[PDB]
């Protein structure tokens, strides 16, 4: 039996994608060691059905610990943003423990995420082949890489333009970019990517040319589950396709000013809404009423519901009352919205999100709320797009394209993983000859 150790980055989205990939490999006769911090293994274990207990084993990775940064904070999930540098640094300091794990388990293959250049280095030292699994899309990487080589040539195929807000943010930054691109460039033979050709095929081919590496799609990896009861009762009283879900993912906390723009945009649109509002794991001034404009929920009345902490995002997107998704455009959230046929109203915040929103706009399965020249969210833009997409329904093309994408994604099956499995098999057979 071929054994694979998988090392996701410490974000819930990355862990979720890695777990879906692990389940696919388990069905193809692979044994998976799934390695992360204990707080992350706790969060992800409920998503793993009992039938995988024989083929997927959870393995603890230890990070340096102190009372000021204790193990329950060794995840991005609800982490105070000011602790994100410490989390990246602590993760890099797990390389010694990671090496001991690889020595004890001796897997045939390492599959590692794009935020850990130490991981393929440890594997190479132990003669363990290692493959990068990038859990996000290709559009942003290619859009970012092209202008370094070709600053005077227009990016091919697309009309996307990155807003000056994010151009200034991504202009330390070089070190993070070099480390991220190293994880892709160091990958043995192929890069596995959590995307699909109907959405990103031409960008996959171009990134493969830019990197001089073969790129292998592993498809939309969407978790589907089999709190919500109260929510379903409220949603069942709404009209079909009348409600937006509002979420900014697992590792972002909109500022009070950003929340004010979102809230007033929801109010002016007159849409029904379910909004997940979260506070970082150490925030004691945690108030939904304080965080939101005064009187907002009382003015919204029957139309608005705020969920504190975590919401059943997939179940809500699948409810027939849901007509749009006001999303930070994290990649798993985009893939879920497309899988369930829900138009996206993009409010990207950082990292790959602005690129993801551009791809959504280009594919026609959503629209993007544009920021002002100073990089600020605009209540008027939020209200206008919800009005057109959801309330008044003058942008039916977005709903039509999302539903067509949903039918394409629902048609896919286990063959989505054939190319990955063949490439893993070939790599291992070649490496065995080289010893």
| Spatial CA neighbour of 135 closest among 57, 58, 220 | 220
Q: How far is the CB of 430 from ligand UDP (least distance, A)?
A: 34
Secondary structure E strands in 8-136: 30-36, 56-60, 109-112, 130-134
Q: For residues 310 and 274, give the distance between their C-alpha atoms in angstroms, rounded to a whole number.
A: 12
Interface segment toward ligand UDP; rule CB under 6 A; list 158-166, 170-178, 181-189, 307-315: 307-315
Residues from 258 through 277 that contact ligand UDP (CB under 6 A): 276
Q: For residues 197 and 219, give the distance between their C-alpha atoms in angstroms, rounded to a whole number.
A: 8
Residues contacting ligand UDP: total by CB under 6 A? 19
Instruction: Say whether residue 348 binds ligand UDP (CB under 6 A).
Output: no
DSSP state of 69: B
Instruction: Say whether residue 254 binds ligand UDP (CB under 6 A).
Output: no
Cβ nearer to ligand UDP, comparing 30 with 139:
139
By 3-state DSSP, what share of the chain in percent is helix, strand and coil, each rounded to 5? 50, 15, 35
Contacts of 6 (CB under 8 A, 6+ apart): 18, 21, 22, 32, 33, 34, 35, 110, 111, 112, 133
Does residue 14 carry a catalytic annotation? yes
Cβ nearer to ligand UDP, comparing 13 with 129:
13
Beta strands at 56-60 and 30-36: parallel, antiparallel or unpaired: parallel
Contacts of 396 (CB under 8 A, 6+ apart): none
Catalytic residue among 108, 113, 163, 328: 113
Instruction: Say whether residue 313 binds ligand UDP (CB under 6 A).
Output: yes
Q: How far is the CB of 367 from ligand UDP (least distance, A)?
A: 18
Interface segment toward ligand UDP; rule CB under 6 A; list 260-268, 305-313, 377-385, 414-422: 305-313
Q: Token digits for 25?
A: 């490999």
From the list 83, 310, 391, 393, which residue makes contact with ligand UDP (rule: CB under 6 A)?
310
Instruction: Say whether residue 311 binds ligand UDP (CB under 6 A).
Output: yes
Instruction: Say whether residue 217 binds ligand UDP (CB under 6 A).
Output: no
Cβ nearer to ligand UDP, comparing 11 with 117:
11
Secondary structure E strands in 77-225: 109-112, 130-134, 190-193, 214-217
Beta strands at 214-217 and 190-193: parallel, antiparallel or unpaired: parallel
Per the listing, tokens 């160091």 go with 186
CB atoms within 10 A of CB 306: 19
Q: How far is the CB of 231 from ligand UDP (least distance, A)?
A: 11
If phi over 0 gives left and psi between -120 and 50 gives alpha, with beta otherwise, what is residue 88?
alpha
Cβ nearer to ligand UDP, comparing 194 with 208:
194
Instruction: Say whether residue 250 binds ligand UDP (CB under 6 A).
Output: yes
Nearest residue to ligand UDP by CB is 330
Instruction: Say whether residue 16 binds ligand UDP (CB under 6 A).
Output: yes
Residues from 319 through 338 that contact ligand UDP (CB under 6 A): 330-333, 336
Residues from 109 through 148 that contact ligand UDP (CB under 6 A): none
Sheet with 56-60, strands from edge to edge, namely 56-60, 30-36, 2-7, 109-112, 130-134, 190-193, 214-217
CB atoms within 10 A of CB 54: 9
Instruction: Say whether residue 352 binds ligand UDP (CB under 6 A).
Output: no
Does residue 434 carry a catalytic annotation? no
Cβ nearer to ligand UDP, comparing 208 with 250:
250
Q: How far is the CB of 356 from ligand UDP (least distance, A)?
A: 9
Computed over its alpha carbons, how large is the radius of gyration of the chain?
A: 22
Interface segment toward ligand UDP; rule CB under 6 A; list 11-19, 121-129, 145-153, 167-175: 11-19
Interface segment toward ligand UDP; rule CB under 6 A; list 12-20, 104-112, 189-197, 411-419: 12-20
The distance in angstroms from the start CA to the end CA of the chain is 18
Residues from 184 through 203 that contact ligand UDP (CB under 6 A): none
From the list 140, 249, 346, 358, which residue makes contact with ligand UDP (rule: CB under 6 A)?
249
Q: How far is the CB of 312 from ligand UDP (least distance, A)?
A: 6
Which parts of this chain interact with ligand UDP (CB under 6 A)?
11-13, 16, 247, 249-252, 276, 310-311, 313-314, 330-333, 336
Question: Which residues does the annotation mark as catalytic?
Answer: 14, 113
């Amino acid at each position: 039996t071929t054994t694979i150790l998988m090392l996701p980055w410490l974000g819930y989205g990355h862990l979720s994608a890695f777990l879906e990939l692990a389940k696919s490999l388990s069905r193809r006769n692979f044994h998976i060691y799934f390695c992360s911090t204990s707080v992350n293994l706790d969060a992800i274990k409920p998503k793993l059905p009992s039938s995988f207990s024989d083929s997927i084993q959870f393995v603890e990775l230890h990070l340096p610990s102190s009372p000021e940064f204790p193990p329950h904070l060794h995840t991005t999930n609800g982490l105070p943003p000011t602790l994100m540098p410490a989390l990246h640094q602590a993760f890099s300091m797990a390389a010694q423990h990671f090496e001991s794990i690889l020595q004890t388990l001796a897997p045939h293959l390492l599959i590692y995420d794009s935020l850990q250049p130490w991981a393929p280095r440890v594997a190479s030292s132990l003669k363990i082949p290692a493959i990068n699994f990038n859990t996000t899309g290709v559009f942003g990487i290619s859009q970012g890489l092209h202008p370094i080589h070709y600053p005077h040539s227009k990016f091919p195929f697309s009309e996307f333009v990155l807003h000056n807000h994010w151009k200034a943010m991504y202009s330390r930054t070089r070190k993070r970019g070099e480390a991220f691109l190293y994880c892709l460039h160091a990958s043995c033979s192929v890069i596995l990517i959590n995307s699909f050709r109907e959405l990103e095929g031409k960008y996959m081919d171009y990134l493969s040319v830019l990197l001089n590496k073969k790129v292998v799609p592993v498809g939309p990896l969407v978790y589907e589950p089999n709190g919500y009861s109260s929510i379903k009762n409220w949603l069942d009283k709404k009209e079909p396709s009348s409600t937006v879900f509002v979420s900014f993912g697992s590792e972002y906390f909109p500022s009070k000013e950003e929340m004010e723009e979102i809230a007033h945009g929801l109010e002016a649109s007159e849409v029904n809404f379910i909004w997940v509002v979260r506070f970082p794991q150490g925030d004691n001034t945690s108030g939904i009423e304080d965080a939101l404009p005064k009187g907002f929920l009382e003015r919204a009345g029957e139309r608005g519901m705020v969920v504190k902490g975590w919401a059943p995002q997939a179940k809500i997107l699948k409810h027939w009352s849901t007509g749009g998704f006001v999303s930070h455009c994290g990649w798993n959230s985009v893939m879920e919205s497309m899988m369930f046929g829900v138009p996206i109203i993009g409010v990207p915040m950082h990292v790959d999100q602005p690129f993801n929103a551009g791809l959504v706009e280009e594919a026609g399965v959503g629209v993007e709320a544009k920021r002002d020249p100073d990089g600020k969210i605009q209540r008027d833009e939020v209200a206008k797009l919800i009005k057109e997409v959801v309330v008044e329904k003058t942008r039916e093309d977005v709903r039509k394209k999302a539903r067509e994408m949903s039918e394409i994604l629902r048609s896919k099956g286990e063959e989505k993983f054939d190319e990955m499995v063949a490439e893993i098999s070939l790599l291992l057979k070649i490496e065995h000859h080289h010893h």
